[PDB]
C-alpha cells in the first residue's frame, strides 16, 4: 500500500468526508486527525519532531520523509492537519499521488474553525473543548503539535490566532499557494457539496453505485460530542450516539 491521494485541504473544509470517500473508493484506510485522536495518539510526538525539523536552519529532508513513511504505512491517502501541512513533501515522496484541495466559503470555514478547532482565547467554549478532550486522553502535547502544524501550513512562526482577519487571509493565501505549487493536471479543487462526480473522474474510477457521498463531522455534531464526553466521561458509553464519525 502506497499513498495515492494527498489531501491538502485545511481542517473544517470537508476532510473527514473526503477521508471516508477515499476509503470507499480504494477499500483501504485514509489518514486524518481523527486517526491520531481516536486510534494512534502515539503519532503526536512523531508529528511534533517532523514539524520541529522544518524549523531548523538546516533541515534533514530524509528524516522528514522517513517519519512520514512510518506514519502513513498502511494508508492509501491523507487528509486534514497535520498531514496537509506537509503536502509539498508528500508530493515529492509520492510523485504519482494526486492532490486534492478541499475548499469552502472562507466565512463558513472560519466559523466552523472557531467552533471545533481554534476558539479564541477569550471564548468560554474553549474550556469545554479542553474538558471533553481530556476524557479522550488529549493533553497539551496534542494542542502544541496541532497548533504548530497549522502555523507551519500558514508559513508563519508568530501568529495572533485570536485575529479573525489574519486567519481569513492565511486561508485564502494557503489555498492560492496550493494551486500555484501543484501542477494543474495533478490537482482537483473539491468544493463543499461537489460529491462524487468530479472526484471520481479525477481519480479514474466510476461513481460508487448506490453509495451517497459522505456528510460527516459537522460542528453541530462536534459540539454534541464535547458535551456528551463532559457529561458521561467515557467515549465508549456515548459512541452509539455518534455513528459514522470515528
Ligand atoms: N458532504 C458535505 N456537504 C456539505 N458539507 C459538508 C459535507 N461533509 C462535510 N461537510 C462539512 O465540512 C465541515 C467538517 O470538515 P472537516 O471534516 O475537515 O473538519 C463541517 O462543516 P460545518 O462545521 O459548518 O458543519 C461539515 O458539515
Ligand atoms: C475532536 C475534538 C473532540 N477535539 C478537539 C480537537 C479537534 C482537532 C483539533 C485540531 C487542531 C488543529 O487542526 C487544533 N488546534 O488548532 O490546536 C485543535 C484541535 N482540537
Amino acid at each position: 500500500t502506497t499513498i495515492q491521494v494527498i489531501g491538502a485541504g485545511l481542517p473544517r473544509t470537508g476532510t473527514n468526508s473526503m477521508k471516508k470517500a477515499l476509503e470507499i473508493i480504494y477499500s483501504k484506510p485514509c489518514y486524518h486527525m481523527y486517526e491520531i485522536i481516536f486510534k494512534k495518539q502515539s503519532d503526536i510526538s512523531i508529528w511534533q519532531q517532523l514539524i520541529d525539523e522544518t524549523h531548523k536552519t538546516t533541515s534533514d529532508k530524509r528524516k522528514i520523509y522517513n517519519g512520514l513513511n512510518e506514519l502513513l504505512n498502511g494508508y492509501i491517502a491523507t487528509t486534514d492537519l497535520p498531514s496537509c501541512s506537509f503536502y509539498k513533501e508528500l508530493m515529492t515522496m509520492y510523485p504519482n499521488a494526486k492532490v486534492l484541495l478541499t475548499i469552502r466559503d472562507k466565512y463558513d470555514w472560519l466559523y466552523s474553525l472557531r467552533k471545533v478547532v481554534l476558539p479564541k482565547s477569550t471564548d468560554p467554549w474553549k474550556l469545554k473543548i479542553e474538558e471533553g478532550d481530556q476524557v479522550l486522553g488529549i493533553d497539551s502535547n496534542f494542542y502544541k503539535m496541532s497548533e504548530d502544524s497549522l502555523k507551519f501550513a500558514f508559513q508563519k512562526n508568530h501568529i495572533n490566532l485570536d485575529d479573525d482577519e489574519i486567519l481569513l487571509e492565511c486561508y485564502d493565501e494557503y489555498n492560492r499557494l496550493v494551486q500555484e505549487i501543484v501542477p494543474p493536471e495533478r490537482l482537483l479543487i473539491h468544493h463543499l457539496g461537489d460529491g462524487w462526480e468530479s472526484l471520481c473522474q479525477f481519480l479514474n474510477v466510476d461513481i460508487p453505485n448506490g453509495i451517497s457521498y459522505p456528510c460527516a463531522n459537522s460542528h453541530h455534531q462536534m459540539t454534541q460530542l464535547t458535551e456528551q464526553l463532559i457529561k458521561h466521561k467515557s467515549l465508549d458509553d456515548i459512541i452509539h450516539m455518534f455513528p459514522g464519525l470515528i
Side-chain angles (χ1 to χ4, degrees):
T1 300
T2 181
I3 292 292
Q4 300 291 316
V5 177
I6 299 157
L10 292 166
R12 311 311 297 172
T13 63
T15 61
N16 194 260
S17 292
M18 182 60 70
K19 175 200 196 287
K20 294 174 158 47
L22 296 169
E23 287 172 355
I24 289 165
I25 290 170
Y26 292 105
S27 293
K28 295 180 176 176
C30 180
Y31 204 83
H32 189 265
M33 184 67 90
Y34 291 2
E35 296 291 307
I36 297 177
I37 292 168
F38 297 100
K39 305 183 187 176
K40 301 176 172 198
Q41 293 183 13
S42 59
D43 286 356
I44 296 169
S45 55
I46 301 179
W47 286 108
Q48 186 63 66
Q49 293 177 335
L50 299 186
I51 300 158
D52 294 342
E53 184 66 23
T54 69
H55 290 150
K56 299 183 169 178
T57 297
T58 302
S59 309
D60 182 6
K61 83 202 276 203
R62 282 167 192 76
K63 174 177 179 180
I64 295 172
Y65 294 171
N66 178 70
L68 289 167
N69 175 77
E70 158 178 32
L71 290 158
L72 304 175
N73 176 40
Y75 289 95
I76 203 74
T78 61
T79 64
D80 203 352
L81 279 174
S83 73
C84 68
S85 72
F86 288 89
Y87 76 85
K88 292 176 257 284
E89 290 74 13
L90 295 170
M91 285 175 61
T92 307
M93 299 167 60
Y94 308 103
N96 304 312
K98 295 176 184 167
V99 180
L100 298 176
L101 177 61
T102 46
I103 199 162
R104 78 188 288 186
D105 178 271
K106 69 173 101 178
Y107 306 105
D108 295 341
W109 168 80
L110 171 65
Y111 193 83
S112 187
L113 194 86
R114 289 296 190 214
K115 274 290 169 61
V116 173
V117 168
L118 194 70
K120 298 195 297 173
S121 66
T122 167
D123 186 343
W125 179 244
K126 187 176 183 174
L127 291 180
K128 293 293 180 162
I129 296 178
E130 178 184 349
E131 184 179 355
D133 290 343
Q134 277 167 8
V135 176
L136 298 176
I138 287 294
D139 64 19
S140 62
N141 296 318
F142 173 87
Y143 297 121
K144 180 180 160 44
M145 181 276 291
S146 54
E147 179 176 308
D148 283 356
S149 85
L150 181 65
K151 295 165 57 179
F152 177 45
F154 289 164
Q155 300 185 324
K156 287 186 182 302
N157 294 291
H158 296 97
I159 180 68
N160 182 9
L161 296 172
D162 293 333
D163 185 340
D164 291 347
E165 166 174 326
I166 297 178
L167 297 182
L168 290 171
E169 290 315 294
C170 284
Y171 176 78
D172 284 347
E173 178 50 40
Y174 175 90
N175 296 329
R176 194 209 61 84
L177 185 58
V178 170
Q179 198 166 6
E180 177 186 328
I181 289 187
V182 181
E185 303 184 346
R186 204 180 167 180
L187 181 61
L188 172 65
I189 296 165
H190 195 267
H191 303 257
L192 214 49
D194 273 4
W196 287 121
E197 202 177 48
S198 59
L199 173 62
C200 293
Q201 167 180 259
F202 179 65
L203 299 181
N204 302 136
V205 300
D206 283 322
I207 295 176
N209 183 26
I211 304 173
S212 59
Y213 188 88
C215 200
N217 202 23
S218 70
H219 73 75
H220 176 73
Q221 181 173 43
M222 284 319 95
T223 294
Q224 294 201 4
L225 180 63
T226 293
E227 293 174 328
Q228 295 298 321
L229 288 168
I230 294 169
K231 178 159 168 178
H232 295 289
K233 307 292 189 195
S234 173
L235 180 60
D236 279 328
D237 296 344
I238 66 168
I239 188 61
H240 71 274
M241 291 184 290
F242 303 93
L245 184 59
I246 67 173

